[PDB]
Amino acid sequence: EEEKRRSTKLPSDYLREMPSVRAPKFDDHPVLKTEYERVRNKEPMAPLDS
Amino acid sequence: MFCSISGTVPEQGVVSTKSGHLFEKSLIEKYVRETGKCPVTGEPLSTEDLLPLKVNKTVKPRTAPATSIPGLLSLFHDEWDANMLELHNTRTQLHQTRQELSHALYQHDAATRVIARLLKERDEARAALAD
Amino acid sequence: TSIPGLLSLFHDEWDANMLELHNTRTQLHQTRQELSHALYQHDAATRVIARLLKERDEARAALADMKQQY
Amino acid sequence: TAPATSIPGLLSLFHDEWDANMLELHNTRTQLHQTRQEL
């Protein structure tokens, strides 16, 4: 714990040195583009035409 | 049985000759030309090396409601729902697992520094007792 | 186009969603290997400093008996 | 070119022309047996 206290570059977000976790690669399909833009909001698609 | 990348039984079953990994045909062709490598490891691969493992998969059994054009497309619907419903959760699991990994790495660095310090402590302790 | 095109583009978009999902799984496998390093390594480092502090207090008791003598 | 309504509208158009073809089944069958009767 005291090792931590005065640690040199205490990040606890040291993922900065971790590789860049990139954006979801569908810049050539708008399909999955809008898919993710909605899906992260989890607002579901309505069931089909009941 | 499943294409390693796919996870469900391939309907165009293909292993690459060089690898030992059985693949989805369209998908792994896209992937070999998409990075130039074997997506199981990163090994360099070419598109013909694919071997058409075809023993006629035709076993996929119609389920009870799925046996229907209205049913098959409704399960098509909730299927794509679930495919993205898994992918996004894997995106955030990557993020939190990655964050945890970063925290662990920082903790490990702190531990190494303490071990380096405490070792100087013990080494000088013993050299002193030698007097 | 209508049905062959619809199914072709559906096959494509599932292909693309799954290439993204395997990007997720591949980075995840790298990360869980990083974990199997890190957490176990910190356990091991706790072990290291435990060994080294026992060594410290052992040399301390050695010098303590030493100067108890004299 | 495909709808940017991607799974919502892709599914709605999937269903729309699926059932258009299923309707082209019915009317064609209907005139078929109509003509069978007339014959």
Automatic annotation (TrEMBL), chain A:
It is found in: Nucleus. It comes from the Eukaryota. Belongs to the SPF27 family. This is Pre-mRNA-splicing factor SPF27.
Automatic annotation (TrEMBL), chain D:
It is found in: Nucleus. Belongs to the WD repeat PRP19 family. Homotetramer. Ubiquitin-protein ligase which is mainly involved pre-mRNA splicing and DNA repair. Required for pre-mRNA splicing as component of the spliceosome. This is Pre-mRNA-processing factor 19.
